[PDB]
């Protein structure tokens, strides 16, 4: 089996550096030249560099994002290529794929397809440190009841790291609630939030708390949230 | 990316045949240059599905062919398949960036369960938060299918970008999908508006939502 194997991956902190190195097994190494693709979490595919096989130089070219700042390089008796990452930056965090460029001849010259690739590591770049969450009410209204039924929540803002769990008047309410996936503000810090749809005729004679935990901070937030009437 | 562009969602039903288009420029697949395109299943790694703009790797199958006609190039997948279900990539070397450049990605939906609009709650920053000087609009869309759509902003009826995050959708307990996007200011920046909007556009309609800072404070 053609297999890629990469490591190196864990949570780093900007302007370090870090050594992504990836094995070859299966194939002949050093007829190949060896690409690496990233993927920011969410988005798309980003080239980051290439270098060639060893009877054309093993010559490298990267991408305009990673010049002057990413190297690579290739030992061909031990079937390795590195990703050399250097002066890292929060928007290096992506997942970083090893990828073979293909031999397969087309009409006069090669192709330069990925046509194996590394099932990839994850390299996270973040100065954050350990936060509890701040808990805000997501109070209901006339504004956010469509029809018989409306909708209240919590605000789980501002923690690091993953994850929060939210749960519903100790975990009685389970009907109507969706919990959200948490975005990556700017800041470096997450936010989620949790909504429940409840009748409005019960609005104003039943309770809804929110229990929120962030274990990694040993902090739980119990908060009520209390109807607005407008 | 801008040089290559594509269509963020396609959708269809079994047994039907759908396309993706692979918008490029003159310095790229104008000029001559081959495209590839790659598949990526769900929480998978990409693996490559065309070379050579109509050529499949061995475990490829026939039901996937590409094309190039000048400034663009075509993925069909003629005879949809649950398993197809993907986000699907186009490259070409561009000689401006001298670098190899990607299209954006589309999200492929084959139809499992009738299509849904979605429904979207827009809540204002509670007076909890502004008393801690912050100030956070929460958008919540809901029950809407397939599993793709876009969010915008606007104060005062002019576009907003900056502050604006957005999650991908995910399941729900009705097995259709969820999203969620927040827009962040500054207390001072809530108060000096006079509306505030969310749009959320899927398989071409959009729903809007408008909250308002001298009202439910």
């Known amino acids: 089996e053609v297999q890629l194997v990469e490591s190196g991956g864990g949570l780093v902190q900007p302007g370090r550096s870090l050594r992504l190195p990836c094995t070859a097994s299966g194939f002949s190494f050093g007829d190949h030249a060896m690409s690496w693709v990233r993927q920011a979490p969410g988005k798309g595919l980003e080239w980051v560099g290439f270098i060639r096989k060893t009877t054309y130089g093993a010559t490298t070219h990267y991408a305009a994002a990673v010049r002057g700042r990413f190297t690579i390089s290739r030992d061909d008796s031990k079937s390795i290529v590195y990703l050399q990452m250097n002066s890292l930056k929060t928007e290096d965090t992506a997942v970083y794929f090893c990828?073979?460029?293909?031999?397969?001849?087309?009409?006069?010259?090669?192709?330069?397809?990925?046509?194996?690739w590394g099932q990839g590591t994850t390299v996270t770049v973040s100065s954050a440190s350990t936060k509890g969450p701040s808990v805000f009410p997501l109070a209901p209204s006339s504004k956010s009841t469509s029809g018989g039924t409306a909708a209240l929540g919590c605000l789980v803002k501002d923690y690091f790291p993953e994850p929060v769990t939210v749960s519903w008047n100790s975990g009685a309410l389970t009907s109507g609630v969706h919990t959200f996936p948490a975005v990556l503000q700017s800041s470096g810090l997450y936010s989620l939030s949790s909504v429940v749809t409840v009748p409005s005729s019960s609005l104003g004679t039943q309770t809804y708390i929110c229990n929120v935990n962030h274990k990694p901070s040993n902090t739980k937030v119990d908060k009520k949230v209390e109807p607005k009437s407008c | 990316e801008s040089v290559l562009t594509q269509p963020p969602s396609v959708s269809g039903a079994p047994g039907q045949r759908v396309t993706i288009s692979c918008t490029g420029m003159?310095?790229?697949?104008?000029?001559?240059?081959?495209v590839y395109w790659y598949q990526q299943l769900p929480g998978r790694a990409p693996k490559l599905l065309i070379y050579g703009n109509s050529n499949r790797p061995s475990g490829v199958p026939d039901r996937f062919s590409g094309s190039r006609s000048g400034t663009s190039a075509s993925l069909a997948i003629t005879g949809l398949q649950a398993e197809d279900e993907a986000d699907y990539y186009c490259q070409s070397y561009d000689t401006s960036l001298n670098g190899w450049a990607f299209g954006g990605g589309t999200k492929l939906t084959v139809l499992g369960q009738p299509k849904a609009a979605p429904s979207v709650t827009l809540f204002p920053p509670s007076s909890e938060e502004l008393q801690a000087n912050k100030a956070t609009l929460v958008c919540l869309v809901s029950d809407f299918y397939p599993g793709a759509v876009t969010v915008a902003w606007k104060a005062d009826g002019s576009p907003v970008k900056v502050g604006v995050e957005t999650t991908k959708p995910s399941k729900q307990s009705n097995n259709k999908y969820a999203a969620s996007s927040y827009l962040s200011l500054t207390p001072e920046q809530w108060k000096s508006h006079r509306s505030y909007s969310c749009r959320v556009t899927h398989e071409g309609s959009t729903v809007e939502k408008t909250v308002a800072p001298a009202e439910c404070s």
């Open positions: 003159n310095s790229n697949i104008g000029a001559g240059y081959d």
């Open positions: 990828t073979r460029v293909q031999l397969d001849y087309g009409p006069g010259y090669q192709y330069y397809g990925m046509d194996v």
